[PDB]
């Protein structure tokens, strides 16, 4: 099918469980940072 | 070596059969070539080493442009893609670097072949990221790629009817 | 009845906005030869952008 | 405390007044305080909810809630609890708080500060620069 | 090879725009291949590939080629601060300049269409450089929201809101810091100005680790009072250190009640922006104190519901969802939401009466604001304690509203009839 | 109506003060309509459709 | 800013004629429109290759 092209086949997904937990914690912390950022944007001057 | 050298004086009709013989030799995609254990792979490596011992860089350059680039028949182009990929895989470090350098030498001539070049570019990219290579030649390859991109971009921007094609692509489906 | 027909008219609004965004992309989508040719699609109309035609 | 205030307290107290399982009344009253216009820290809320365990569901009366708020009111200052603070901040008995027990308090709260930050904090608190902080300086900072 | 040299295969003609574009596509494919290697990626960025791709290859070619070019640019900037800062700056320059005279030049519809899709796809790429990308996104969002022009909203503010929504509400996890209750430890004005004092690292350092509360079977009564005291006077220590000026000043959880929040919650340009703002506010409502603050914000925006009519459906859904618990209904009632909604209902009914004697202007949504305000009042009354405390104060306004609605004959709309029925039920219940 | 207005406004010898007043009224109505069209909720849709599709 | 590009083509040509009339025998007025056109052309040229919306 699409496996003839080596370059397109290149993309390799790989993601580990403890690194899953670390990445999910990073997502949650980034979300919290953006929440605080927008809330500080809304703060009356 | 003589089968390849003959594949030079044959029609594009005879090209695929010679390419499939070369594929049964390099244990390539014989089935795909037709459509378009350890000792066996040892024979494959021995055959590619023999070909690299015989095939000078000029003939290598010639068939690589003849079948990967000027084939005009995607089926022959895929056969050459598989053949060259297995040639590079079964080759050692020096022949790998030499083949990569030859294809990067053909790279500037790409604008003369247009769409046909697709398969060629594939191998190039793969090889350029598969062979451990020095920083100097990495920079050289990157400069070649970006130079071709800049040349094509300037050509398209200053093309006499670039405005027409852009607007039509925007509106009517052509 | 007017409330109902109001919803239908404003129900197209989002779809119309989508068609607008798609045409604004101005992508060269070559005319697709759909197997179903029951609709009276002329060569000129087929040439006209489908997003344009959908809009 | 002016009547205007006690009336407002009773208004919200009556509005949030509710009963059920656990100690809802405690939660309802914590929400009253925040509704009144004074938002205590989660820690303050937990402390007051515990500081009231007279009957099932943390039964709170209006006089009882008045007593609760009368203790801290706006929490502007509490030299009595500031001394108790020095008592706690100084893990080993009392006398002079040190950077060690200060960082101990910080971790117990859940805050992690580099020793460098702890040194900044102690340099700020100390006035006579004897490497020690007494109520004289703890109280001074709490009233700075 | 002699025959091949003589003639072999076929070649393209000169000035072949079609083949020239095919060679451009091959260049894009090759560069997407090369960019995978980090050293090659840095070399290509040093060449100047990002600017070339931005100026020329972003807007020309087939849509698949455009998306491949966007992916190639994202790959070059991936984990590359110099490359990502440069790309973000290019995006800001092209978007900001288009905002100037957006009315004069409405091409924006397609002008930034590609630059903002690049920002969106970049945000999708997760890297440490995420900070600069989020900065660009927030800046563009604020600038475009300061603009009410739909063309500007629907393009810039909509993609910026979608970026902020995908950042705040992360793709659901498949397998660490808690904010201060009364304070916002992040700053927006300083962070956008690239100040090292305000940053994700510094901010995350500021707040305490969540850690483990523990004490599952331990009452720790004494420890609770102890931790109360230490927390209170440690926060006092920091507050005093900051008023002396030796530490960064935290922010107080307080809102102006007329911020871009309302501007988006109500945007007739498209519901997309309104839905994105509703999702953002719902995700901002994670913390109970922040729930209180956003609830105050929304109950202040309540007037804009009457102003905007049926455009406020998403805001209404958000507001009813946030107060679905009687806890927050009672909180808002304590703050005085019931007289506010009663006055709003009275004003809307008076406006209808004023129109009743005016021209016979038929309106399809006529009464959406009235019906929604009455539904809010009924939702609050559906709690026993609020009913007890506010029957005597709501009977007058409900009687006046029902009597004034009964006068309507020509302007009586189905929604008006539902509102009158709800008022009758509330009166009977009162 | 506008016809007569314009004609009369240029046919009656009139004072500078009321000439300025009439000009201010005309330009004020123009500014109001321009702002209304620019900020109109579906102004983008109508502009794009006028560009592409006959209606 | 507003009336040059919106409306029916007859309305656009009427707006252009109105501007030409406003700039008749008026060195200040003619200069203003000329400078507006100059700035527009310059900013479009700033990135004609970058942005194909120049036309
Ligand atoms: Ca000590
Ligand atoms: Ca001392």
Provide the terminal-to-terminal Cα distance of chain E, rounded to the nearest Å: 102
Instruction: Based on the fold, state whether residues D24 and D39 are members of the same structural domain.
Output: yes
Residue E232 and residue D111: Cβ atoms within 8 Å?
Answer: no
CATH number for D44? 1.10.238.10
Whole-angstrom distance, CA of residue E208 vs CA of residue E204: 8
CA D103–ligand 1 middle distance (angstroms)? 13
Q: Take residue C39 and report the two structure tokens written for it.
A: 């609709």
- Contact D48/D30 with Cβ under 8 angstroms? yes
Which residue among C28, C46, C50 places its CB closest to the CB of B169?
C28
The residues in E 291-320 lying below 8 A from B, measured between CB atoms, are none
- Count of CB atoms situated within 10 Å of the CB of E45: 21
Same domain, D36 and D93: no
Cβ contacts of G49 on chain B, cutoff 8 Å: 157
Identify whether residues D9 and D61 lie together within a single domain: yes
Q: Which of E86, E108, E89 is nearest to E98 (CA)?
A: E108
B141 touches B121 (CB < 8 A): no
Is residue C3 within 8 A of residue E414, CB to CB? The reply is yes
Shared domain for D89 and D65, answered yes or no, is no
Q: What separation in angstroms does the CA of E136 have from each of B30, E73, E108?
A: 53, 16, 18
CA atoms within 13 Å, Cβ hemisphere of E335: 22
Separation of alpha carbons E114 and E112, rounded Å: 5
List CB contacts of D42: < 8 A, sequence separation 6 or more: E181
Chain centre to alpha carbon of residue D132: 25
**What backbone torsions phi and psi does residue E184 show, to the nearest 5 degrees?**
-110, 110
Last residue of a domain, one of D27, D49, D75: D75
Whether residues D29 and D84 share a domain: the answer is: no
CA dist D102 and D90 (Å) reads 7
Residue D70 CA, chain-centre distance (Å), reads 13
Helix axis angle, E326-335 to E337-356, nearest 10°: 80
Together in a domain, D62 and D80 = no
- Cβ proximity of E139 and E164 under 8 Å: no
**D18 is in which domain, residue-wise?**
2-75
Q: Does G10 touch chain F (CB under 8 A)?
A: no
**Cβ-Cβ contacts under 8 Å, C20 against chain E:** 109
Secondary structure (3-state) at E267:
coil
Residues D136 and D100 placed together within one structural domain of the fold: yes
Domain-terminating residue out of D23, D54, D75: D75
> How far apart are alpha carbons E361 and E117 in whole angstroms?
43
Cβ count within 10 A of residue E11? 15
What is the DSSP secondary structure assignment for residue E177, as one 8-state letter? B
- What tokens does E327 get? 């806890």
- Tell which residue, B25, B23, B101, has the closest CA to residue B67: B23
Considering the domain architecture, whether residues D82 and D94 belong to the same structural domain is answered as yes
Spacing of C-alpha D104 from chain mean position: 18
Dmax (CA) for chain G in angstroms is: 38
D69 shares its domain with D81 = no
Of D75, D98, D121, the residue that ends a domain is D75
- DSSP secondary structure letters along D23-42: THHHHHHHHHHHHHT----H
Q: Rounded to a whole number, what is the distance in Å from the CA of E427 to chain F's nearest CA? A: 39
State in Å: Cα D102 to ligand 1 middle.
Answer: 10
Residue with tokens 């950077």: D99
Q: How far apart are CA D101 and CA E183, in angstroms?
A: 26
**Residue of chain E with shortest Cα separation from B145:** E27
The total of structural domains in chain D comes to 2
D119 is known to lie in a ligand binding site: no
Rounded to whole angstroms, the Cα distance separating B78 from B85 reads 10
Contact yes or no for E169/E279 (Cβ under 8 A): yes
Which chain F residues are closer than 8 Å to G2 by Cβ? 34, 37-38
D107 in the same domain as D51: no
Tokens read off for E232? 């209170």
Stretch (H or E) spanning D133:
none
Flag whether D126 is marked binding.
yes
| D96 C-alpha to ligand 2 centroid (Å) | 8
Contact A5 B123 (CB under 8 A): no
Instruction: Give the largest CA-CA distance in chain F.
Output: 48
Nearest residue to E27 via CA among D65, B143, D68, D103 = B143
CB atoms within 10 A of CB D51: 16
What does each C-alpha distance from B17 to B13, B25, B81, B86, C36 come to in angstroms? 8, 12, 15, 18, 40
Nearest to E287 by CA among E178, E372, E204: E178
Element (H, E) at A1: none
Query: B88-116 burial, b if ≥16 CB within 10 A, otherwise e?
Result: bebbeeebbbebbbbbbebbeebbbbbeb
Q: Are residues D60 and D89 in the same domain?
A: no
Find the closest chain E residue to D122 by CA distance.
E237
For the CA atoms of chain F, what is the radius of gyration? 17
For residue G35, the tally of other CB atoms under 10 A from its CB is 10
Q: How far apart are CA E115 and CA E110, in angstroms?
A: 9
d(CA E317, CA E234) in angstroms, rounded, equals 41
Rounded to the nearest 5 percent, the helix, strand and coil shares of chain D are 60, 0, 35
Q: What is the C-alpha to C-alpha distance for residues G4 and F46, in angstroms, rounded to an integer?
A: 16
Contact (CB, 8 A) for D115 and E266: no
- Check: CB of residue E323 under 8 Å from CB of residue E292: no
E243 to chain D: closest CA residue: D144
Q: Is B159 helix (H, G, I), strand (E, B) or coil?
A: coil
Q: Using the 8-state DSSP alphabet, how is residue E156 labeled?
A: I
Q: What gap in Å lies between CA B4 and CA D34, rounded to an integer?
A: 87
Experimental determination approach used: cryo-EM
| Min Cα separation F46/chain E (Å) | 11
Closest-CA distance, E35 to chain B, in angstroms, reads 9
CA contacts within 13 A on the Cβ side of E83: 27
Does one domain contain both D29 and D66? Answer: yes
């Amino acid at each position: 099918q699409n496996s003839q092209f080596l370059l397109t086949r290149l993309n390799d997904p790989k993601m580990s469980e403890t690194e899953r937990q670390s990445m999910e914690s990073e997502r949650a912390d980034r979300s919290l940072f953006v929440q605080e950022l927008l809330l500080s944007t809304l703060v009356r001057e | 070596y003589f089968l390849l050298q003959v594949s030079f004086l044959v029609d594009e009709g005879v090209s695929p059969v010679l390419l499939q013989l070369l594929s049964c030799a390099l244990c390539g995609s014989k089935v795909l070539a037709a459509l378009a254990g350890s000792q066996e792979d040892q024979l494959c490596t021995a055959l590619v080493n023999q070909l690299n011992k015989f095939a000078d860089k000029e003939t290598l350059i010639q068939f690589l442009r003849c079948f990967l680039l000027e084939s005009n028949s995607s089926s022959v182009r895929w056969q050459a893609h598989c053949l060259t990929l297995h040639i590079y895989r079964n080759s050692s470090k020096s022949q790998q670097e030499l083949l990569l350098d030859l294809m990067w030498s053909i790279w500037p001539e790409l604008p003369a072949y247009g769409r046909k070049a697709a398969q060629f570019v594939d191998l190039l990219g793969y090889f350029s990221l598969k062979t451990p290579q020095t920083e100097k030649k990495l920079k050289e390859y990157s400069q070649k790629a970006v130079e071709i991109l800049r040349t094509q971009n300037h050509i398209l921007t200053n093309h006499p009817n670039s405005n027409i094609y852009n607007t039509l692509s925007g509106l009517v489906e052509f | 009845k007017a409330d109902r027909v109001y919803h239908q008219l404003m129900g197209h609004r989002p779809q119309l906005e989508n068609l607008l965004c798609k045409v604004n992309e101005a992508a060269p989508e070559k005319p697709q030869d759909d197997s179903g040719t029951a609709g009276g699609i002329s060569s000129t109309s087929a040439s006209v952008n489908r997003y344009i035609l959908q809009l | 405390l002016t009547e205007e205030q006690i009336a407002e307290f009773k208004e919200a107290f009556s509005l949030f007044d509710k009963d059920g399982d656990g100690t809802i009344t405690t939660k309802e009253l914590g929400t009253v305080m925040r509704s009144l216009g004074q938002n205590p820290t989660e820690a303050e809320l937990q402390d007051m909810i515990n500081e009231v365990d007279a009957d099932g569901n943390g039964t709170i009366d209006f006089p009882e809630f008045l007593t609760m708020m009368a203790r801290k009111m706006k929490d502007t200052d509490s030299e009595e609890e500031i001394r108790e603070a020095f008592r706690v901040f100084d893990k080993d008995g009392n006398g002079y708080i040190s950077a060690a027990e200060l960082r101990h308090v910080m971790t117990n709260l859940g805050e992690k500060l580099t020793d460098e930050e702890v040194d900044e904090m102690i340099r700020e608190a100390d006035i006579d620069g004897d490497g020690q902080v007494n109520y004289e300086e703890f109280v001074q900072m709490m009233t700075a | 090879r002699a025959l091949s040299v003589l003639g072999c295969g076929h070649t393209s003609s000169t000035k072949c725009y079609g083949c020239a574009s095919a060679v451009t596509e091959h260049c894009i494919t090759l560069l997407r291949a090369l960019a995978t290697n980090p050293a090659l990626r840095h070399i290509l960025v040093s060449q100047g590939l990002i600017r070339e791709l931005f100026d020329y290859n972003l807007r020309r070619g087939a849509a698949a080629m455009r998306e491949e070019v966007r992916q190639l640019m994202c790959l070059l900037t991936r984990d590359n601060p110099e490359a990502t800062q440069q790309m973000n700056d290019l995006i800001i320059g092209k978007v900001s300049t288009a905002l100037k005279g957006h009315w004069a030049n409405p091409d924006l519809a397609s002008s930034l269409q590609y630059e903002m899709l690049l920002l969106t796809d970049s945000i999708s790429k997760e890297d440490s450089c995420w900070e600069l990308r989020l900065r660009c996104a927030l800046s563009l969002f604020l600038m475009a929201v300061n603009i009410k022009t739909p063309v500007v909203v629907e393009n810039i503010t909509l993609m910026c809101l979608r970026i902020l929504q995908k950042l705040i509400k992360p793709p659901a996890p498949t397998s660490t810091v808690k904010p201060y209750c009364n304070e916002i430890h992040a700053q927006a004005q300083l962070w956008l100005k690239r100040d090292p004092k305000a940053s994700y690292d510094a901010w995350k350092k500021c707040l305490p680790i969540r850690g483990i509360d523990g004490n599952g079977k331990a009452p720790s009564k004494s420890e609770l009072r102890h931790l109360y005291l230490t927390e209170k006077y440690v926060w006092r220590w920091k507050q005093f250190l900051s008023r002396r000026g030796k530490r960064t000043s935290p922010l107080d959880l307080k809102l102006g009640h007329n911020n871009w929040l309302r501007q988006v919650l109500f945007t007739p340009a498209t519901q997309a922006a309104r839905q994105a703002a509703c999702t953002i506010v719902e995700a901002l409502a994670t913390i109970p104190s922040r729930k209180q603050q956003v609830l105050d914000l929304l109950t202040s925006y309540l007037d804009e519901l009457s102003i905007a009519g049926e455009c406020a459906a998403e805001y209404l859904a958000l507001y009813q969802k946030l107060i679905t618990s009687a806890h927050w209904k009672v909180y808002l009632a304590a703050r005085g939401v019931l007289p506010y909604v009663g006055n709003l209902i009275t004003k809307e009914i008076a406006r209808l009466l004023a129109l009743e004697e005016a021209t016979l202007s038929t309106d399809l949504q006529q009464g959406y604001a009235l019906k929604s305000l009455t539904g809010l009042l009924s939702s609050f009354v559906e709690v026993e304690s609020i009913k007890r405390h506010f029957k005597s104060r709501l009977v007058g306004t409900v009687l006046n509203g029902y009597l004034c609605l009964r006068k309507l004959v020509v302007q009586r709309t189905k929604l008006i009839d539902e509102t009158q029925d709800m008022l009758l039920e509330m009166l009977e219940d009162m």
